[PDB]
Amino acid sequence: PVTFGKNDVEIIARETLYRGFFSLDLYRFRHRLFNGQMSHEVRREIFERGHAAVLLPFDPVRDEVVLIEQIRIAAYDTSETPWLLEMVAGMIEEGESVEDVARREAIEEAGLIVKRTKPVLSFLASPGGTSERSSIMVGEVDATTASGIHGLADENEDIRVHVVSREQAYQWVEEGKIDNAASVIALQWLQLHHQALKNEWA
Amino acid sequence: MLKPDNLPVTFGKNDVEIIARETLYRGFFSLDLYRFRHRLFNGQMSHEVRREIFERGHAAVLLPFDPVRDEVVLIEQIRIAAYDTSETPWLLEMVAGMIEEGESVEDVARREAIEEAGLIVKRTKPVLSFLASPGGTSERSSIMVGEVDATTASLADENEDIRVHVVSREQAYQWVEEGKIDNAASVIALQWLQLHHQALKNEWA
Ligand SMILES: Nc1ncnc2c1ncn2[C@@H]1O[C@H](COP(=O)(O)OP(=O)(O)OC[C@H]2O[C@@H](O)[C@H](O)[C@@H]2O)[C@@H](O)[C@H]1O
Ligand SMILES: Nc1ncnc2c1ncn2[C@@H]1O[C@H](COP(=O)(O)OP(=O)(O)OC[C@H]2O[C@@H](O)[C@H](O)[C@@H]2O)[C@@H](O)[C@H]1O
């Protein structure tokens, strides 16, 4: 498939245009064109924010999924409401493993203790403007135990847990009611492998 | 008065107030800071919360599908941001382009099919619109399936920056499973296609 590699690109320099909580960097490079020749110098504004771990809580016995509801204002301008239905997720820090961030966030966000876990897919959200990569895991859970609303809330992570059938959640994806990349991808994956996973677990 | 719209979540836009958006950095792509308050599930109202959001516009995505030959037309192109976490910055993607003012998702998809892959799309069909990573970017991408004759492979206009690859639907999907195609729009598009190919082929028969 892909011909070219890292030796076919010369990164001239990287510069931080802005550095706050996240970073906005500028990549200046030259690369091979699809005719051999090397291009001129190209500039790219790249959003640097680290990488994420995602966990799809799936109850094989009940054939259910556990969703996380929390506000995401970046969704404001193009959605009817900023509050989205999502998967458990968290940023991967200094040498943490994807599985551990996923399992830890399952406790913090949904109050669930994941049992067996399995790798699904790893994707780049939008490779044209950000370096962010998200790695999905499917974790065996007991929907029956998820937490409820926090009396005293975490204001930068106020979550409401939703438990729904596997089919329901998938239909919402097709209907557009669930439309964040991690959820759409994980839920489509589940829809293509649910019987094999149900047979493997329990 | 008319009844309120239905929501699959607890709160709507009337439950959140945006104090302001200040520009942290300005370029054709910008990084802004949203300052806002919102109702909490416990029934109270939050203190000001601040978020850095990547403003980069929105994209139109086209999945080139030949239902008769059961093939898919991919596009190879360099994505430098994929560099630090990928074996090669050259990815296999879907036809895609930025949506401009007064342009529909379909018009962009159709225009992009021609200049990126030299394809002329016939019937189109909405697939899905998704938020790439809503916690830090506002970017929204709308996908469509474009009926195409895979034999119309092409050189295109941007053949020096983009190379087309015509493959079977099954090979495309197998590459998604193996991690050989891992960019969001392509993964979502191809999984949707693996779930609907028969109905779509019957429809476009
Ligand atoms: N970070 C950037 N900085 C400067 N120029 C850019 C950038 N991103 C794209 N461009 C330039 O513009 C051309 C394409 O611009 P767009 O219209 O934005 O289309 P595309 O780059 O393919 O973005 C669409 C697809 O990639 C994902 O990032 C996004 O989620 C969408 O699925 C490219 O050839 C490239 O040279
Ligand atoms: N835009 C932002 N600006 C400033 N602080 C932020 C922002 N986003 C998150 N934070 C801070 O970091 C914490 C979030 O940590 P994580 O749990 O790691 O982030 P998360 O919200 O889960 O975002 C990762 C998930 O959302 C998508 O953007 C991404 O694809 C991934 O699936 C929050 O408590 C908040 O204080």
mmCIF file of N, CA and C in Angstrom, chain A residues 15-125:
data_model
loop_
_atom_site.group_PDB
_atom_site.id
_atom_site.type_symbol
_atom_site.label_atom_id
_atom_site.label_comp_id
_atom_site.label_asym_id
_atom_site.label_seq_id
_atom_site.Cartn_x
_atom_site.Cartn_y
_atom_site.Cartn_z
ATOM 1 N N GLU A 15 8.053 24.587 16.003
ATOM 2 C CA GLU A 15 8.019 25.780 16.838
ATOM 3 C C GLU A 15 6.697 25.871 17.554
ATOM 4 N N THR A 16 6.728 26.235 18.828
ATOM 5 C CA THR A 16 5.485 26.357 19.566
ATOM 6 C C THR A 16 4.948 27.772 19.386
ATOM 7 N N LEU A 17 3.836 27.887 18.667
ATOM 8 C CA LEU A 17 3.208 29.180 18.429
ATOM 9 C C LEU A 17 2.503 29.612 19.702
ATOM 10 N N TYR A 18 1.986 28.639 20.446
ATOM 11 C CA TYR A 18 1.294 28.915 21.697
ATOM 12 C C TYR A 18 1.375 27.729 22.646
ATOM 13 N N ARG A 19 1.610 28.015 23.923
ATOM 14 C CA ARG A 19 1.675 26.967 24.930
ATOM 15 C C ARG A 19 0.926 27.369 26.200
ATOM 16 N N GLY A 20 -0.187 26.688 26.439
ATOM 17 C CA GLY A 20 -0.984 26.921 27.625
ATOM 18 C C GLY A 20 -1.199 25.531 28.188
ATOM 19 N N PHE A 21 -2.454 25.143 28.395
ATOM 20 C CA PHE A 21 -2.760 23.808 28.907
ATOM 21 C C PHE A 21 -2.374 22.822 27.817
ATOM 22 N N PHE A 22 -2.728 23.179 26.589
ATOM 23 C CA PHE A 22 -2.412 22.383 25.412
ATOM 24 C C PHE A 22 -1.386 23.176 24.612
ATOM 25 N N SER A 23 -0.969 22.634 23.480
ATOM 26 C CA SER A 23 -0.003 23.331 22.640
ATOM 27 C C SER A 23 -0.449 23.410 21.199
ATOM 28 N N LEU A 24 -0.071 24.502 20.548
ATOM 29 C CA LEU A 24 -0.339 24.657 19.132
ATOM 30 C C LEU A 24 1.066 24.790 18.531
ATOM 31 N N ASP A 25 1.487 23.788 17.765
ATOM 32 C CA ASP A 25 2.814 23.817 17.174
ATOM 33 C C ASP A 25 2.829 24.034 15.660
ATOM 34 N N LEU A 26 3.978 24.443 15.136
ATOM 35 C CA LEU A 26 4.137 24.647 13.702
ATOM 36 C C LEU A 26 5.205 23.675 13.234
ATOM 37 N N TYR A 27 4.859 22.828 12.274
ATOM 38 C CA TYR A 27 5.798 21.875 11.712
ATOM 39 C C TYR A 27 6.223 22.434 10.354
ATOM 40 N N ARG A 28 7.527 22.538 10.123
ATOM 41 C CA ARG A 28 8.049 23.028 8.848
ATOM 42 C C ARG A 28 8.857 21.870 8.275
ATOM 43 N N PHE A 29 8.457 21.388 7.101
ATOM 44 C CA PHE A 29 9.117 20.239 6.504
ATOM 45 C C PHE A 29 9.078 20.205 4.975
ATOM 46 N N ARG A 30 9.794 19.237 4.415
ATOM 47 C CA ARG A 30 9.843 19.011 2.973
ATOM 48 C C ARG A 30 9.635 17.509 2.883
ATOM 49 N N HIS A 31 8.945 17.047 1.849
ATOM 50 C CA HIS A 31 8.691 15.616 1.698
ATOM 51 C C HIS A 31 8.675 15.227 0.225
ATOM 52 N N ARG A 32 8.739 13.923 -0.039
ATOM 53 C CA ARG A 32 8.720 13.401 -1.403
ATOM 54 C C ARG A 32 7.329 13.463 -2.007
ATOM 55 N N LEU A 33 7.257 13.934 -3.248
ATOM 56 C CA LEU A 33 5.990 14.012 -3.952
ATOM 57 C C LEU A 33 5.775 12.646 -4.614
ATOM 58 N N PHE A 34 4.590 12.407 -5.170
ATOM 59 C CA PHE A 34 4.324 11.128 -5.813
ATOM 60 C C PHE A 34 4.868 11.098 -7.231
ATOM 61 N N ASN A 35 6.070 11.625 -7.401
ATOM 62 C CA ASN A 35 6.731 11.642 -8.691
ATOM 63 C C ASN A 35 8.220 11.656 -8.374
ATOM 64 N N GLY A 36 8.540 11.235 -7.151
ATOM 65 C CA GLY A 36 9.916 11.188 -6.697
ATOM 66 C C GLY A 36 10.370 12.498 -6.088
ATOM 67 N N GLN A 37 10.455 13.530 -6.924
ATOM 68 C CA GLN A 37 10.884 14.866 -6.503
ATOM 69 C C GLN A 37 10.450 15.253 -5.082
ATOM 70 N N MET A 38 11.228 16.138 -4.464
ATOM 71 C CA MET A 38 10.946 16.624 -3.119
ATOM 72 C C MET A 38 10.178 17.935 -3.237
ATOM 73 N N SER A 39 9.229 18.143 -2.334
ATOM 74 C CA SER A 39 8.418 19.351 -2.357
ATOM 75 C C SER A 39 9.197 20.554 -1.855
ATOM 76 N N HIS A 40 8.547 21.714 -1.882
ATOM 77 C CA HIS A 40 9.143 22.940 -1.368
ATOM 78 C C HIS A 40 8.960 22.773 0.130
ATOM 79 N N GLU A 41 9.146 23.851 0.877
ATOM 80 C CA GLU A 41 8.959 23.799 2.321
ATOM 81 C C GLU A 41 7.475 23.969 2.627
ATOM 82 N N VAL A 42 6.911 23.026 3.378
ATOM 83 C CA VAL A 42 5.501 23.068 3.740
ATOM 84 C C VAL A 42 5.329 23.440 5.207
ATOM 85 N N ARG A 43 4.265 24.179 5.508
ATOM 86 C CA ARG A 43 3.964 24.608 6.875
ATOM 87 C C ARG A 43 2.648 24.009 7.330
ATOM 88 N N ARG A 44 2.601 23.569 8.583
ATOM 89 C CA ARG A 44 1.413 22.947 9.131
ATOM 90 C C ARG A 44 1.199 23.352 10.583
ATOM 91 N N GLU A 45 0.023 23.905 10.888
ATOM 92 C CA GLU A 45 -0.317 24.275 12.265
ATOM 93 C C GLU A 45 -0.896 23.006 12.880
ATOM 94 N N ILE A 46 -0.212 22.464 13.879
ATOM 95 C CA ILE A 46 -0.644 21.224 14.523
ATOM 96 C C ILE A 46 -1.006 21.359 16.002
ATOM 97 N N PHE A 47 -2.215 20.919 16.331
ATOM 98 C CA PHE A 47 -2.722 20.947 17.691
ATOM 99 C C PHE A 47 -2.144 19.757 18.473
ATOM 100 N N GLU A 48 -1.297 20.068 19.450
ATOM 101 C CA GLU A 48 -0.667 19.067 20.294
ATOM 102 C C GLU A 48 -1.348 19.012 21.663
ATOM 103 N N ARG A 49 -2.003 17.898 21.982
ATOM 104 C CA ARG A 49 -2.681 17.773 23.273
ATOM 105 C C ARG A 49 -2.479 16.428 23.964
ATOM 106 N N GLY A 50 -1.469 15.674 23.548
ATOM 107 C CA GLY A 50 -1.255 14.370 24.150
ATOM 108 C C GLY A 50 -2.135 13.347 23.456
ATOM 109 N N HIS A 51 -2.192 12.140 24.010
ATOM 110 C CA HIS A 51 -2.984 11.065 23.426
ATOM 111 C C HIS A 51 -3.961 10.463 24.437
ATOM 112 N N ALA A 52 -5.013 9.817 23.954
ATOM 113 C CA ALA A 52 -6.010 9.289 24.879
ATOM 114 C C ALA A 52 -6.267 7.789 24.891
ATOM 115 N N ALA A 53 -6.872 7.354 25.989
ATOM 116 C CA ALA A 53 -7.245 5.966 26.179
ATOM 117 C C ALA A 53 -8.767 5.993 26.261
ATOM 118 N N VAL A 54 -9.405 5.042 25.595
ATOM 119 C CA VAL A 54 -10.856 4.972 25.587
ATOM 120 C C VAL A 54 -11.300 3.583 26.004
ATOM 121 N N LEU A 55 -12.383 3.512 26.771
ATOM 122 C CA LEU A 55 -12.897 2.223 27.199
ATOM 123 C C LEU A 55 -14.395 2.105 27.009
ATOM 124 N N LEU A 56 -14.782 1.068 26.277
ATOM 125 C CA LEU A 56 -16.179 0.757 26.016
ATOM 126 C C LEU A 56 -16.612 -0.278 27.079
ATOM 127 N N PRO A 57 -17.513 0.116 28.000
ATOM 128 C CA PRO A 57 -17.996 -0.792 29.053
ATOM 129 C C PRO A 57 -19.104 -1.666 28.480
ATOM 130 N N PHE A 58 -18.842 -2.961 28.321
ATOM 131 C CA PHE A 58 -19.833 -3.865 27.756
ATOM 132 C C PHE A 58 -20.197 -5.024 28.701
ATOM 133 N N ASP A 59 -21.496 -5.167 28.960
ATOM 134 C CA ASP A 59 -22.025 -6.223 29.820
ATOM 135 C C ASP A 59 -22.539 -7.323 28.895
ATOM 136 N N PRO A 60 -21.761 -8.418 28.732
ATOM 137 C CA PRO A 60 -22.078 -9.566 27.877
ATOM 138 C C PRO A 60 -23.366 -10.287 28.280
ATOM 139 N N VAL A 61 -23.525 -10.469 29.588
ATOM 140 C CA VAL A 61 -24.681 -11.141 30.155
ATOM 141 C C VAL A 61 -25.953 -10.405 29.774
ATOM 142 N N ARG A 62 -25.997 -9.112 30.069
ATOM 143 C CA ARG A 62 -27.164 -8.299 29.760
ATOM 144 C C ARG A 62 -27.151 -7.713 28.351
ATOM 145 N N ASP A 63 -26.026 -7.849 27.652
ATOM 146 C CA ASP A 63 -25.897 -7.308 26.295
ATOM 147 C C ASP A 63 -26.142 -5.798 26.370
ATOM 148 N N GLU A 64 -25.410 -5.142 27.261
ATOM 149 C CA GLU A 64 -25.558 -3.713 27.446
ATOM 150 C C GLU A 64 -24.259 -2.919 27.404
ATOM 151 N N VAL A 65 -24.426 -1.625 27.178
ATOM 152 C CA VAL A 65 -23.321 -0.693 27.121
ATOM 153 C C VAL A 65 -23.561 0.380 28.185
ATOM 154 N N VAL A 66 -22.482 0.905 28.754
ATOM 155 C CA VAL A 66 -22.571 1.951 29.763
ATOM 156 C C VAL A 66 -21.999 3.239 29.144
ATOM 157 N N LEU A 67 -22.849 4.249 28.962
ATOM 158 C CA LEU A 67 -22.418 5.515 28.374
ATOM 159 C C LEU A 67 -22.180 6.580 29.431
ATOM 160 N N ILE A 68 -21.342 7.553 29.089
ATOM 161 C CA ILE A 68 -20.997 8.663 29.985
ATOM 162 C C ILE A 68 -21.552 9.982 29.425
ATOM 163 N N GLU A 69 -22.367 10.681 30.201
ATOM 164 C CA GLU A 69 -22.886 11.960 29.725
ATOM 165 C C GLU A 69 -22.188 13.110 30.431
ATOM 166 N N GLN A 70 -21.575 14.001 29.656
ATOM 167 C CA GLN A 70 -20.908 15.166 30.219
ATOM 168 C C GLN A 70 -20.844 16.250 29.140
ATOM 169 N N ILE A 71 -20.774 17.519 29.547
ATOM 170 C CA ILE A 71 -20.732 18.616 28.581
ATOM 171 C C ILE A 71 -19.376 18.751 27.896
ATOM 172 N N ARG A 72 -19.426 19.119 26.621
ATOM 173 C CA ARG A 72 -18.258 19.341 25.779
ATOM 174 C C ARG A 72 -18.615 20.591 24.960
ATOM 175 N N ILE A 73 -18.274 21.778 25.470
ATOM 176 C CA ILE A 73 -18.618 23.025 24.773
ATOM 177 C C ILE A 73 -18.056 23.191 23.385
ATOM 178 N N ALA A 74 -16.990 22.473 23.051
ATOM 179 C CA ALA A 74 -16.423 22.581 21.719
ATOM 180 C C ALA A 74 -17.469 22.084 20.726
ATOM 181 N N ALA A 75 -18.413 21.299 21.221
ATOM 182 C CA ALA A 75 -19.478 20.755 20.385
ATOM 183 C C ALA A 75 -20.598 21.779 20.168
ATOM 184 N N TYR A 76 -20.638 22.792 21.031
ATOM 185 C CA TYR A 76 -21.670 23.831 20.996
ATOM 186 C C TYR A 76 -22.083 24.349 19.613
ATOM 187 N N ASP A 77 -21.149 24.959 18.898
ATOM 188 C CA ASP A 77 -21.443 25.537 17.583
ATOM 189 C C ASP A 77 -22.040 24.649 16.478
ATOM 190 N N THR A 78 -21.838 23.339 16.537
ATOM 191 C CA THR A 78 -22.350 22.463 15.480
ATOM 192 C C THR A 78 -23.313 21.373 15.938
ATOM 193 N N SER A 79 -23.686 21.402 17.210
ATOM 194 C CA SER A 79 -24.579 20.406 17.775
ATOM 195 C C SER A 79 -25.751 21.146 18.399
ATOM 196 N N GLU A 80 -26.842 20.432 18.664
ATOM 197 C CA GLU A 80 -28.013 21.057 19.272
ATOM 198 C C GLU A 80 -27.784 21.241 20.765
ATOM 199 N N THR A 81 -26.913 20.417 21.333
ATOM 200 C CA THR A 81 -26.585 20.524 22.747
ATOM 201 C C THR A 81 -25.139 20.072 22.942
ATOM 202 N N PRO A 82 -24.388 20.752 23.829
ATOM 203 C CA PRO A 82 -22.979 20.435 24.132
ATOM 204 C C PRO A 82 -22.805 19.176 24.972
ATOM 205 N N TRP A 83 -23.867 18.775 25.663
ATOM 206 C CA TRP A 83 -23.837 17.568 26.483
ATOM 207 C C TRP A 83 -23.889 16.339 25.559
ATOM 208 N N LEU A 84 -22.825 15.546 25.576
ATOM 209 C CA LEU A 84 -22.745 14.368 24.721
ATOM 210 C C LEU A 84 -22.785 13.049 25.483
ATOM 211 N N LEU A 85 -23.109 11.985 24.739
ATOM 212 C CA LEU A 85 -23.157 10.600 25.231
ATOM 213 C C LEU A 85 -21.825 10.012 24.762
ATOM 214 N N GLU A 86 -20.988 9.563 25.696
ATOM 215 C CA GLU A 86 -19.671 9.060 25.317
ATOM 216 C C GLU A 86 -19.167 7.787 25.972
ATOM 217 N N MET A 87 -17.928 7.453 25.622
ATOM 218 C CA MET A 87 -17.242 6.291 26.168
ATOM 219 C C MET A 87 -16.382 6.822 27.308
ATOM 220 N N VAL A 88 -15.940 5.916 28.174
ATOM 221 C CA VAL A 88 -15.047 6.286 29.261
ATOM 222 C C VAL A 88 -13.730 6.622 28.540
ATOM 223 N N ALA A 89 -13.031 7.648 29.001
ATOM 224 C CA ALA A 89 -11.783 8.026 28.367
ATOM 225 C C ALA A 89 -10.939 8.930 29.257
ATOM 226 N N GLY A 90 -9.652 9.025 28.927
ATOM 227 C CA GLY A 90 -8.744 9.859 29.692
ATOM 228 C C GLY A 90 -7.416 10.011 28.981
ATOM 229 N N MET A 91 -6.685 11.082 29.288
ATOM 230 C CA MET A 91 -5.386 11.346 28.676
ATOM 231 C C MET A 91 -4.327 10.421 29.253
ATOM 232 N N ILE A 92 -3.473 9.911 28.378
ATOM 233 C CA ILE A 92 -2.396 9.015 28.776
ATOM 234 C C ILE A 92 -1.196 9.865 29.189
ATOM 235 N N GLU A 93 -0.778 9.723 30.442
ATOM 236 C CA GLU A 93 0.353 10.484 30.968
ATOM 237 C C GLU A 93 1.666 9.710 31.000
ATOM 238 N N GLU A 94 2.711 10.392 31.457
ATOM 239 C CA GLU A 94 4.053 9.834 31.542
ATOM 240 C C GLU A 94 4.170 8.320 31.708
ATOM 241 N N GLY A 95 4.396 7.642 30.589
ATOM 242 C CA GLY A 95 4.570 6.202 30.605
ATOM 243 C C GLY A 95 3.487 5.343 31.235
ATOM 244 N N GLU A 96 2.223 5.726 31.068
ATOM 245 C CA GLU A 96 1.123 4.922 31.600
ATOM 246 C C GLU A 96 0.768 4.022 30.431
ATOM 247 N N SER A 97 0.112 2.901 30.705
ATOM 248 C CA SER A 97 -0.292 2.005 29.628
ATOM 249 C C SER A 97 -1.729 2.376 29.273
ATOM 250 N N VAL A 98 -2.123 2.114 28.034
ATOM 251 C CA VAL A 98 -3.468 2.435 27.582
ATOM 252 C C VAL A 98 -4.532 1.720 28.420
ATOM 253 N N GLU A 99 -4.308 0.437 28.692
ATOM 254 C CA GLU A 99 -5.227 -0.380 29.481
ATOM 255 C C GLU A 99 -5.453 0.163 30.883
ATOM 256 N N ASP A 100 -4.377 0.600 31.530
ATOM 257 C CA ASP A 100 -4.484 1.118 32.885
ATOM 258 C C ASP A 100 -5.225 2.452 32.956
ATOM 259 N N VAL A 101 -5.034 3.325 31.967
ATOM 260 C CA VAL A 101 -5.744 4.597 31.989
ATOM 261 C C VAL A 101 -7.223 4.296 31.799
ATOM 262 N N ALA A 102 -7.508 3.375 30.883
ATOM 263 C CA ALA A 102 -8.875 2.958 30.586
ATOM 264 C C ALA A 102 -9.597 2.387 31.815
ATOM 265 N N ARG A 103 -8.940 1.462 32.518
ATOM 266 C CA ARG A 103 -9.502 0.819 33.714
ATOM 267 C C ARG A 103 -9.685 1.775 34.897
ATOM 268 N N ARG A 104 -8.732 2.688 35.069
ATOM 269 C CA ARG A 104 -8.771 3.677 36.133
ATOM 270 C C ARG A 104 -9.927 4.664 35.873
ATOM 271 N N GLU A 105 -10.061 5.132 34.629
ATOM 272 C CA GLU A 105 -11.125 6.078 34.277
ATOM 273 C C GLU A 105 -12.512 5.425 34.376
ATOM 274 N N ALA A 106 -12.549 4.103 34.247
ATOM 275 C CA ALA A 106 -13.805 3.373 34.344
ATOM 276 C C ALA A 106 -14.282 3.487 35.784
ATOM 277 N N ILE A 107 -13.337 3.505 36.714
ATOM 278 C CA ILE A 107 -13.696 3.620 38.116
ATOM 279 C C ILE A 107 -14.150 5.046 38.419
ATOM 280 N N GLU A 108 -13.303 6.015 38.083
ATOM 281 C CA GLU A 108 -13.599 7.423 38.324
ATOM 282 C C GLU A 108 -14.852 7.964 37.625
ATOM 283 N N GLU A 109 -15.004 7.677 36.333
ATOM 284 C CA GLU A 109 -16.147 8.189 35.574
ATOM 285 C C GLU A 109 -17.467 7.421 35.655
ATOM 286 N N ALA A 110 -17.401 6.096 35.723
ATOM 287 C CA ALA A 110 -18.607 5.275 35.766
ATOM 288 C C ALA A 110 -18.733 4.431 37.028
ATOM 289 N N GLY A 111 -17.739 4.517 37.909
ATOM 290 C CA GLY A 111 -17.762 3.745 39.141
ATOM 291 C C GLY A 111 -17.757 2.238 38.926
ATOM 292 N N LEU A 112 -17.296 1.802 37.759
ATOM 293 C CA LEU A 112 -17.255 0.381 37.430
ATOM 294 C C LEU A 112 -15.859 -0.206 37.527
ATOM 295 N N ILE A 113 -15.792 -1.454 37.959
ATOM 296 C CA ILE A 113 -14.520 -2.140 38.045
ATOM 297 C C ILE A 113 -14.521 -3.121 36.878
ATOM 298 N N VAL A 114 -13.836 -2.757 35.798
ATOM 299 C CA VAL A 114 -13.736 -3.599 34.613
ATOM 300 C C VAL A 114 -13.125 -4.971 34.945
ATOM 301 N N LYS A 115 -13.695 -6.038 34.378
ATOM 302 C CA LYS A 115 -13.193 -7.403 34.589
ATOM 303 C C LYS A 115 -12.163 -7.725 33.499
ATOM 304 N N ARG A 116 -12.520 -8.566 32.530
ATOM 305 C CA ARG A 116 -11.589 -8.867 31.444
ATOM 306 C C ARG A 116 -11.593 -7.701 30.459
ATOM 307 N N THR A 117 -10.450 -7.438 29.844
ATOM 308 C CA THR A 117 -10.374 -6.345 28.893
ATOM 309 C C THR A 117 -9.678 -6.819 27.625
ATOM 310 N N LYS A 118 -9.982 -6.159 26.515
ATOM 311 C CA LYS A 118 -9.419 -6.548 25.234
ATOM 312 C C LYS A 118 -9.217 -5.342 24.321
ATOM 313 N N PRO A 119 -8.102 -5.314 23.567
ATOM 314 C CA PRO A 119 -7.826 -4.196 22.654
ATOM 315 C C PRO A 119 -8.752 -4.241 21.446
ATOM 316 N N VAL A 120 -9.222 -3.071 21.021
ATOM 317 C CA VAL A 120 -10.120 -2.932 19.878
ATOM 318 C C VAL A 120 -9.414 -2.301 18.661
ATOM 319 N N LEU A 121 -9.373 -0.963 18.634
ATOM 320 C CA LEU A 121 -8.739 -0.186 17.555
ATOM 321 C C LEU A 121 -8.023 1.028 18.140
ATOM 322 N N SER A 122 -7.060 1.564 17.398
ATOM 323 C CA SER A 122 -6.320 2.762 17.815
ATOM 324 C C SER A 122 -6.427 3.714 16.641
ATOM 325 N N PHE A 123 -6.942 4.919 16.863
ATOM 326 C CA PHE A 123 -7.088 5.855 15.753
ATOM 327 C C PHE A 123 -6.601 7.283 15.992
ATOM 328 N N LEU A 124 -6.404 7.988 14.887
ATOM 329 C CA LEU A 124 -5.989 9.383 14.903
ATOM 330 C C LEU A 124 -7.296 10.155 14.654
ATOM 331 N N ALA A 125 -7.668 11.026 15.585
ATOM 332 C CA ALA A 125 -8.910 11.791 15.468
ATOM 333 C C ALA A 125 -9.060 12.575 14.163
#
